Amino acid sequence: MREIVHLQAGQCGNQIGAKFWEVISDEHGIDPTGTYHGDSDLQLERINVYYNEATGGKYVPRAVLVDLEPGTMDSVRSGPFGQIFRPDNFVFGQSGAGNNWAKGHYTEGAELVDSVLDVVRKEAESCDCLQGFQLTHSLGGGTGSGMGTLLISKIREEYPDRIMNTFSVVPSPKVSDTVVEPYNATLSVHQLVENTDETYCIDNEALYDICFRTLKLTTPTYGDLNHLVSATMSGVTTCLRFPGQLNADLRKLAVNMVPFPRLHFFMPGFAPLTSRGSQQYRALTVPELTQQMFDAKNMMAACDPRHGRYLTVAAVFRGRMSMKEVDEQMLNVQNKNSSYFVEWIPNNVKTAVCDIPPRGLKMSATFIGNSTAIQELFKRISEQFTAMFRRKAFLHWYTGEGMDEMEFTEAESNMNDLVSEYQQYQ
Amino acid sequence: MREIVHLQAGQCGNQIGAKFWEVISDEHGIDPTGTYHGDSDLQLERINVYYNEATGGKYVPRAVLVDLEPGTMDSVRSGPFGQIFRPDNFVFGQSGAGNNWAKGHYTEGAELVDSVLDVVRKEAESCDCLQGFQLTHSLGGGTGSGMGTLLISKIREEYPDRIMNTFSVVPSPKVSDTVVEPYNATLSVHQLVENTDETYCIDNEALYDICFRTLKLTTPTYGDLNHLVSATMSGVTTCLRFPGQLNADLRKLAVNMVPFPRLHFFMPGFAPLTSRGSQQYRALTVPELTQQMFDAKNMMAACDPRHGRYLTVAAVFRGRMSMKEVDEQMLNVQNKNSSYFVEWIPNNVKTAVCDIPPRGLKMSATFIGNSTAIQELFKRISEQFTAMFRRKAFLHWYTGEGMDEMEFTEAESNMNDLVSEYQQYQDA
Amino acid sequence: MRECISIHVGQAGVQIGNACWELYCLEHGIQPDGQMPSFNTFFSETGAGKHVPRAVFVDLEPTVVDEVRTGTYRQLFHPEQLITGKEDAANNYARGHYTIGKEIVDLVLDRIRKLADLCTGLQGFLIFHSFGGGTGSGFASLLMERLSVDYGKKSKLEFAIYPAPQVSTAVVEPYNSILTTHTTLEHSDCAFMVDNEAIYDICRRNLDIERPTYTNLNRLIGQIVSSITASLRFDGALNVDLTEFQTNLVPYPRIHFPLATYAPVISAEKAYHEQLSVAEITNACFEPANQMVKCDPRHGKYMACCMLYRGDVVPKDVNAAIATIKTKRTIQFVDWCPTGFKVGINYQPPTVVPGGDLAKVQRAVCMLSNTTAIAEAWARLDHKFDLMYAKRAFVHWYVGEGMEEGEFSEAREDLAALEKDYEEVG
Amino acid sequence: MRECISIHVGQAGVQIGNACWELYCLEHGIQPDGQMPDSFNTFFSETGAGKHVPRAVFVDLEPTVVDEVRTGTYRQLFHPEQLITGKEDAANNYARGHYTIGKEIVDLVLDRIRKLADLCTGLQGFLIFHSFGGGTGSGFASLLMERLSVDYGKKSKLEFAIYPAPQVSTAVVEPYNSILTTHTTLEHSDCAFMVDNEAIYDICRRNLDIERPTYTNLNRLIGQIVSSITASLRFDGALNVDLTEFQTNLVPYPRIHFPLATYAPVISAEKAYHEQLSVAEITNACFEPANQMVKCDPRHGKYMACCMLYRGDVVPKDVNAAIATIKTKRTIQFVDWCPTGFKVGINYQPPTVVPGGDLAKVQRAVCMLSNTTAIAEAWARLDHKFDLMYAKRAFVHWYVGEGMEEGEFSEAREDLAALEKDYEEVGV
Amino acid sequence: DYWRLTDALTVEKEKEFEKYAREVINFESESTKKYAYPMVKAVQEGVGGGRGPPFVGRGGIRPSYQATDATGVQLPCFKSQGSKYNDFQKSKRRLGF
Numbered sequence A: 001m002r003e004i005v006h007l008q009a010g011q012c013g014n015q016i017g018a019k020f021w022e023v024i025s026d027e028h029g030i031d032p033t034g035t036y037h038g039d040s041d042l043q044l045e046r047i048n049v050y051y052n053e054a055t056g057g058k059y060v061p062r063a064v065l066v067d068l069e070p071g072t073m074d075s076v077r078s079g080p081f082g083q084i085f086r087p088d089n090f091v092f093g094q095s096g097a098g099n100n101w102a103k104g105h106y107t108e109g110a111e112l113v114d115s116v117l118d119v120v121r122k123e124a125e126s127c128d129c130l131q132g133f134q135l136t137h138s139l140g141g142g143t144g145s146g147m148g149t150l151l152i153s154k155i156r157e158e159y160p161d162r163i164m165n166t167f168s169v170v171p172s173p174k175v176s177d178t179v180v181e182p183y184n185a186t187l188s189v190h191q192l193v194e195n196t197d198e199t200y201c202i203d204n205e206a207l208y209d210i211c212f213r214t215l216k217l218t219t220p221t222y223g224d225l226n227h228l229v230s231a232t233m234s235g236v237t238t239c240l241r242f243p244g245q246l247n248a249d250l251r252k253l254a255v256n257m258v259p260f261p262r263l264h265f266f267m268p269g270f271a272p273l274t275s276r277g278s279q280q281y282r283a284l285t286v287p288e289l290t291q292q293m294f295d296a297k298n299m300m301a302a303c304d305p306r307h308g309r310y311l312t313v314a315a316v317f318r319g320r321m322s323m324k325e326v327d328e329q330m331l332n333v334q335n336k337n338s339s340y341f342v343e344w345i346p347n348n349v350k351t352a353v354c355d356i357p358p359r360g361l362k363m364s365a366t367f368i369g370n371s372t373a374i375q376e377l378f379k380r381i382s383e384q385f386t387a388m389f390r391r392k393a394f395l396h397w398y399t400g401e402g403m404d405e406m407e408f409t410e411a412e413s414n415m416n417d418l419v420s421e422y423q424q425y426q
Numbered sequence B: 001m002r003e004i005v006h007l008q009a010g011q012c013g014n015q016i017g018a019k020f021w022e023v024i025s026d027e028h029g030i031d032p033t034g035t036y037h038g039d040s041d042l043q044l045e046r047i048n049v050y051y052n053e054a055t056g057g058k059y060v061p062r063a064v065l066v067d068l069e070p071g072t073m074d075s076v077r078s079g080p081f082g083q084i085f086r087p088d089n090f091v092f093g094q095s096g097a098g099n100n101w102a103k104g105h106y107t108e109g110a111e112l113v114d115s116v117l118d119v120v121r122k123e124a125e126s127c128d129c130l131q132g133f134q135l136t137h138s139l140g141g142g143t144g145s146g147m148g149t150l151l152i153s154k155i156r157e158e159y160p161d162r163i164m165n166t167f168s169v170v171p172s173p174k175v176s177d178t179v180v181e182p183y184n185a186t187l188s189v190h191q192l193v194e195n196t197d198e199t200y201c202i203d204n205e206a207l208y209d210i211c212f213r214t215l216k217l218t219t220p221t222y223g224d225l226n227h228l229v230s231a232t233m234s235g236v237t238t239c240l241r242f243p244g245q246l247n248a249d250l251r252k253l254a255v256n257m258v259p260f261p262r263l264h265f266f267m268p269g270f271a272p273l274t275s276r277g278s279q280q281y282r283a284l285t286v287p288e289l290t291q292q293m294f295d296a297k298n299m300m301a302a303c304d305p306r307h308g309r310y311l312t313v314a315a316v317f318r319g320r321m322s323m324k325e326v327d328e329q330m331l332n333v334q335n336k337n338s339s340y341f342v343e344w345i346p347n348n349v350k351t352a353v354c355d356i357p358p359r360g361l362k363m364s365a366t367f368i369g370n371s372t373a374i375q376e377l378f379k380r381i382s383e384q385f386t387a388m389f390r391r392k393a394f395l396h397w398y399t400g401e402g403m404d405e406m407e408f409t410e411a412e413s414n415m416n417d418l419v420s421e422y423q424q425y426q427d428a
Numbered sequence C: 001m002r003e004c005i006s007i008h009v010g011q012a013g014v015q016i017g018n019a020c021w022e023l024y025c026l027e028h029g030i031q032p033d034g035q036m037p038s039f040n041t042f043f044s045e046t047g048a049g050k051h052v053p054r055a056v057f058v059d060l061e062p063t064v065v066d067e068v069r070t071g072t073y074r075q076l077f078h079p080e081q082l083i084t085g086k087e088d089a090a091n092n093y094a095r096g097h098y099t100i101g102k103e104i105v106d107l108v109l110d111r112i113r114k115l116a117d118l119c120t121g122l123q124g125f126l127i128f129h130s131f132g133g134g135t136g137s138g139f140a141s142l143l144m145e146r147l148s149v150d151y152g153k154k155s156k157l158e159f160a161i162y163p164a165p166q167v168s169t170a171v172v173e174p175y176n177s178i179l180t181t182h183t184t185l186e187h188s189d190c191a192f193m194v195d196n197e198a199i200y201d202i203c204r205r206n207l208d209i210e211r212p213t214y215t216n217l218n219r220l221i222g223q224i225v226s227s228i229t230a231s232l233r234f235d236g237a238l239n240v241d242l243t244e245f246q247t248n249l250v251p252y253p254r255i256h257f258p259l260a261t262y263a264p265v266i267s268a269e270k271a272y273h274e275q276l277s278v279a280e281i282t283n284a285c286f287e288p289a290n291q292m293v294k295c296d297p298r299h300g301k302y303m304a305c306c307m308l309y310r311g312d313v314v315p316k317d318v319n320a321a322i323a324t325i326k327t328k329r330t331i332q333f334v335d336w337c338p339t340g341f342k343v344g345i346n347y348q349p350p351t352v353v354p355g356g357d358l359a360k361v362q363r364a365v366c367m368l369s370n371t372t373a374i375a376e377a378w379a380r381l382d383h384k385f386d387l388m389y390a391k392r393a394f395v396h397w398y399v400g401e402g403m404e405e406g407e408f409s410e411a412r413e414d415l416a417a418l419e420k421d422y423e424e425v426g
Numbered sequence D: 001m002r003e004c005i006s007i008h009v010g011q012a013g014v015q016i017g018n019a020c021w022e023l024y025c026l027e028h029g030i031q032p033d034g035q036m037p038d039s040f041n042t043f044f045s046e047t048g049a050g051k052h053v054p055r056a057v058f059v060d061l062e063p064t065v066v067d068e069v070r071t072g073t074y075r076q077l078f079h080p081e082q083l084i085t086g087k088e089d090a091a092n093n094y095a096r097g098h099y100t101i102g103k104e105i106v107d108l109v110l111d112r113i114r115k116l117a118d119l120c121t122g123l124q125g126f127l128i129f130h131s132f133g134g135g136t137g138s139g140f141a142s143l144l145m146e147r148l149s150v151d152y153g154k155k156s157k158l159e160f161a162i163y164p165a166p167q168v169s170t171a172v173v174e175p176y177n178s179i180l181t182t183h184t185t186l187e188h189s190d191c192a193f194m195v196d197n198e199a200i201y202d203i204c205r206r207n208l209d210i211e212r213p214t215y216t217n218l219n220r221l222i223g224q225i226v227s228s229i230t231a232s233l234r235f236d237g238a239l240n241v242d243l244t245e246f247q248t249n250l251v252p253y254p255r256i257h258f259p260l261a262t263y264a265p266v267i268s269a270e271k272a273y274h275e276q277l278s279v280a281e282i283t284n285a286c287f288e289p290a291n292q293m294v295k296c297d298p299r300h301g302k303y304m305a306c307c308m309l310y311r312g313d314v315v316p317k318d319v320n321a322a323i324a325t326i327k328t329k330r331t332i333q334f335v336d337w338c339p340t341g342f343k344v345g346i347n348y349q350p351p352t353v354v355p356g357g358d359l360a361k362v363q364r365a366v367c368m369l370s371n372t373t374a375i376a377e378a379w380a381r382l383d384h385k386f387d388l389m390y391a392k393r394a395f396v397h398w399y400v401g402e403g404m405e406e407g408e409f410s411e412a413r414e415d416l417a418a419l420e421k422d423y424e425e426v427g428v
Numbered sequence E: 001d002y003w004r005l006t007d008a009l010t011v012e013k014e015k016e017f018e019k020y021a022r023e024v025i026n027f028e029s030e031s032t033k034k035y036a037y038p039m040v041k042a043v044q045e046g047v048g049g050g051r052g053p054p055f056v057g058r059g060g061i062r063p064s065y066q067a068t069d070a071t072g073v074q075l076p077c078f079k080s081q082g083s084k085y086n087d088f089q090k091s092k093r094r095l096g097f
């Protein structure tokens, strides 16, 4: 009726989705066995969006876990909800790419699409009415950055009308763990602009900034980072799974979020993160959510929106509120920070309400927005890729795969054309 | 509705602000836990002036604690009312100023001004109708005397109409703890004249003199000194928080006070101060309050008003009273000591009544007045600052920060221009 | 499933392999018989339920391997795996490459062929030898040459003793060293050049042992190889395979010579009195006085750094240490690497042998920097070989063995060209 | 948080370290092993095994002095790598310690200070202790300031050291080292704490009734001085004074960074039995020339700045009363360019007592740091002696044979004529 | 009561692992007590990164104080008398009010 298939690419994608599938299983009251132990009828009313029915009152995630190395599948099923996934949905190869975009995209990509596409088509023919698939991957890897681009291109030909969201992981320049990282990001964003309806730019560094300051966690592991990135995309589709006073879904936002097809990159935002000491002195109010929402430190991307102009704003609220406060806070923030908003679009903010609160919490809010600050990231990649590509450095690994040299030039041309028309819209 | 945000600068400011947040917590019946344990409905009707709501029936002070040294906050937090303040309001750093006005105002303050500006704007946008902010600091420091001037300059540009009152601490010449204290003071009062609606000059030595004589305390600590200033300034807004026979506010006093914008320095006075032996033989009467107040010993500044001319007088009263004596005493003191009052303005006395008595006490009164005695402080600083600048002593500390030398002169030139026109108001 | 096969050659190869294998046995809990009272990457199961080391010890002298044959681990090891010769080269690359190799080339090749048949998915070939001994030089050269055409894609790691710049156990070592470099240039993927004198200085200075020995050195060699292989053996938040850290170490086909470092290395008595944390250990990895090759990277410029933490460690502290080391002007980077780090984390702390020297420590670090400061050692060797070849000393030995004397000048010119290429990078 | 690192130089530096750190162990409560059965972080550092490690660099050019510490009671208190030794010493030669022998161990010490600076997050300043007499304490010490000045331009560099006593002397070639060291304590020092042992000799015998004192008895008193300076940093107080606070309020010009210290009261337990201790009594002893720790009389000079550190059971009331009495004394002269030259500092915790010491357990204490121009006569005596040495060309062959130019002697001698002249300009 | 219920739930969930934490300490301290120091440091660290005294009114909550440029060093308590507060009532009878 409106179903989503959870594509999963890379070690980063596998760990992110594994934390995600646990989170909504808590939300829908699904045990590790796969049955329903929940209490409310709404906890099992629209669970068919992500789950598929099995005998014995059992439900299976509609996820296709893909990676080029089998060394991560063990840790996937070693986790809490490791046995909830169907084993036939696990698709993986033997030899990885070694963070080489070339190897994942072309050489060891060619044989593994057929197993992925057959599994993807099987879940595609399972549900009657698909809203769209969902893929999480990293732009600094060899499979998520590499292989991860290829299956997107083929499913656009196979399924053009379906919504295509990507919670990609953009590498950071201040903190980076890969030397060939700019080369992979150079050849992946070109695939993003051509074939993607919307992209969510996440950054691990800004996640690390939040936990140090906003949460003040002493020892933040990647599970904590996976907890945040699962929470925001849980807030994307909570209005889909549960009724609200003002309903919305992916297509309500995506149509309202894309003024022109070339621009589909957004930075998300989650309102109630407070440290344990911050729990003691607060009053839970909608203005407090909005105040923490627009503070530039709350963004988990690597771009401050105060240097850019704001194209379009989304604010999706999870729980029970009164919208007169919600409309007054959107109106208050629109007029006050007038310089940061574009003038050719009055009323840049889109609002949505989801009646069901997040589990364990009373009030929350989720935020999506497109601003001129995202172009700060792309040229920042260009300063490093061109520094690499001028001396033909690290090229024989790519050149040994079998492509020619103009692909870097056209990928460099595409994002330079991207930021140029992005600068014109400022 | 009518809200106040407390700006807190320096070790002096942090301690007195902590003392001030305790007395009104006792007044508004707020436990160190944070909830409300009071008995009277009027104890909780206007608590939103200083407190903000927190879930679970809790109220948080609307304070912004600032200092350049991190160890002062731990003394604030280890204080008994240390778990009443929200931690995000606390803003500080590890690099101090070393009693240098220049380091606070330019070098190290520039990295911290952004965060406190975020905090005060957060508290400003919280309340619907803000009357103004409130900063308390010392002129003998490096943070409150230093970057505290920089905070004031910014928020006047951001919020011009809002009131900006300062219970600033002016250093004493007879007892001092800093040699560059005239240097910081001369570079601070010039920031005061340009950007401040009203200022109250409290001297610690005058506070020291009072407990030497009026209270006869054997070992009064600075907490006692913190106790007087909190009680003095709680009497400023007791009419604001609680209705009275004749209501008044900060803007009611300030508009009725300031004849020309260049003059906003005053000496405050407090009525109910008696030693233990004085409690045995007394009668709580209106004249005794008025009689005690106009004696120059009670005053917490280092200026004798008998050497100057009282420009205007504001006298607010706390507790339930009649206006028969209140008017009969102010008229009596106006006529008797005519030479100490200017002739250009009749009826210099401004009066206000607050019905609610102070906690645990019956009668009280608070007074704010402008006189021609205040230059006894300013010009005596000029007897120091000029006699320290001509040889360029202690200048490399200030010169190493990157500023010029014309700034000392212009601050001095403004201070000589300040007194000179104000001299002219004495003989007018 | 990941597999690394040992191809150790020479007296150094045999002693180092016995070292590394006692560390592997104590790590995996295997008793000296080969019975357990993770492991599969090095061991292999048998019908009798024993665990079989995947090592090929090859030597031209019998006694070095007969010491193992009568050692404790005799029943643990394979009589067929241990390959011995009757007559040695006696520090003669020509003997080792032309006269004595062909007798047992076929036997060694067949042994590694059966080991590769036993393995299913081969990750790597770890090959240990020396640049001084005629055996460890010429035999290593020929087995690289044939192994390259036997397995084109399978990666070949090259751990080898380089002659020390001051102390030497041979006079005819530089001829073998200059003649061997062709194979480590055109038949190697990574090279881990080591001189003894650096480890000598390290163990005297830090470890307080005034009279160490070759087994004391081999303990640290086994420790660094174990820390390299720990990500394959056990779980980590960021597992690092061989392909990943070779890709983020090798920019060009001619530059595959990184320098290594292990920290912390302190005795237990001094380990009583200091905190060991991420910042201190990563600062100790950067000191020129702790470098295991006699050169100062401060005289050169780092252009790649692979990083392998181990034990009790948090990525927050990892990123903080990365920021701290990046904010240092004494440490330089080449202009074409704004981001030159390859970070990996493993959970299990490094184990300890009884009778060893390092104390048991909860967190450790292994550093692998590719820089341009290594070329000065090759320059010293070039001067020494030039003043060797000027008077044509010891030439008669090799000529009687039967090689062509122009190969000496060809190797000298080739290493000069390699130094010139390193100058071009620098 | 605040941290202090000791870079004591010389055998004397090793010995005062032994005295200081035993005292530091007693106040916080460190066992001889190093476990408690954060006031300690400024001196100690936590380990993985939870050991609290001294943050001092013991550096010496001879093995025997530091090896005694290696076999002392606190052998398992100090890190063995930290105690840096030298195989050969200079033997009362500045030149050997500054041009030949120092260079072998320059880096190894300089790697240590960096590693100690690694452990600390916010570093306040550096405590460097040495002696002007010994070659290592003069030669090796002079070079290290020159290098750490460019390594840490902003970090404070305190200097307690030992000046040659104007009559008694343990060396003949001491003035050559003493003169050639004065250049470094001018352009590579922030403060200085010159002391002759003879002044301590007179004070201890006169006051503490120990007719046969040893060097440890002296080092206990110097440890009390350093303890009093850091006491406001280690523990809370009404007026906490950090390192930068009194660096600013003691130094009028960059060329003038030589105050004189004074500690009081210093009296035996039998002596303490019969006499009352009060703030006025204990502060009056601080201005007595016979109790001064430098052989000069400030009554022959003028104070331009006095720094005041109250410790123990002290009250701000008696603080101001004592200041009032001292300001009313013609015997105490002040410069015309500092009317307020008292820098008040108040701490709560009383100074602890070491078993086997000389000071009895007292409740209140005072510390004095007065800069005056009467110190300049002591340098003139050194100029009087060293010049009459240097004309005779004696011991010149020793220094010239090391490899330094003989013209630096005249330049160093010429310098101190300018420093003495500058102190005369302030005296006008 | 909804937030009051969650307050008691936080007390409930913090307790249950403390039993699981404690039984390892008693099991580990079966041979020698010379070696139980890191447990005592671990179970006395407190809820959150705080160094000062616990607040019994709020349930032992230790709020942190981390606002210091990019460093964020936690504030340590130098330790003092920490005397009971004036209440403004003790002095008012000390001053006779």
Ligand SMILES: Nc1nc2c(ncn2[C@@H]2O[C@H](COP(=O)(O)OP(=O)(O)OP(=O)(O)O)[C@@H](O)[C@H]2O)c(=O)[nH]1
Binding pocket: C009, C010, C011, C012, C013, C015, C016, C059, C060, C061, C088, C089, C090, C091, C092, C130, C132, C133, C134, C135, C136, C137, C161, C169, C170, C196, C214, C217, C218
């Ligand atoms: N690090 C280390 N080096 C060794 C060891 N054994 C030998 N070497 C080095 O190897 C060099 C000589 O070669 P060997 O390993 O002894 O013997 P080989 O490799 O079989 O070559 P040939 O002597 O010609 O037979 C010496 O210079 C040593 O530096 C060892 O156990 N550890």
Ligand SMILES: Nc1nc2c(ncn2[C@@H]2O[C@H](COP(=O)(O)OP(=O)(O)OP(=O)(O)O)[C@@H](O)[C@H]2O)c(=O)[nH]1
Binding pocket: D009, D010, D011, D012, D013, D015, D016, D060, D061, D062, D089, D090, D091, D092, D093, D131, D133, D134, D135, D136, D137, D138, D162, D169, D170, D171, D197, D215, D218, D219
């Ligand atoms: N206050 C004090 N001064 C000392 C002490 N020991 C030595 N001195 C002074 O230091 C001078 C000699 O320097 P030393 O510390 O003994 O030796 P050094 O500094 O290492 O220099 P060299 O003797 O050349 O090695 C003597 O003239 C004393 O005046 C001490 O224990 N306490």
Ligand SMILES: Nc1nc2c(ncn2[C@@H]2O[C@H](COP(=O)(O)OP(=O)(O)O)[C@@H](O)[C@H]2O)c(=O)[nH]1
Binding pocket: A009, A010, A011, A012, A015, A016, A067, A068, A097, A099, A138, A140, A141, A142, A143, A144, A145, A146, A169, A177, A178, A204, A222, A223, A225, A226
């Ligand atoms: N935020 C986040 N990032 C992760 C996590 N796990 C891995 N990563 C990132 O993923 C990158 C490595 O991805 P990789 O395994 O090469 O991707 P693949 O080639 O597609 O399999 C690293 O740079 C990590 O920063 C996680 O749990 N959270």
Ligand SMILES: Nc1nc2c(ncn2[C@@H]2O[C@H](COP(=O)(O)OP(=O)(O)O)[C@@H](O)[C@H]2O)c(=O)[nH]1
Binding pocket: B009, B010, B011, B012, B015, B016, B067, B068, B097, B099, B137, B138, B140, B141, B142, B143, B144, B145, B146, B169, B177, B204, B222, B223, B225, B226, D238
């Ligand atoms: N009246 C009063 N004055 C105080 C108190 N605490 C400190 N002071 C004064 O404040 C001055 C030092 O302030 P300082 O810490 O340098 O201010 P900052 O630089 O703004 O932090 C001293 O001269 C004291 O007289 C107090 O509790 N009450």
Ligand SMILES: [Mg+2]
Binding pocket: C010, C011, C061, C088, C133, C134, C135, C136
């Ligand atoms: Mg051999």
Ligand SMILES: [Mg+2]
Binding pocket: D010, D011, D062, D089, D134, D135, D136
């Ligand atoms: Mg000596």
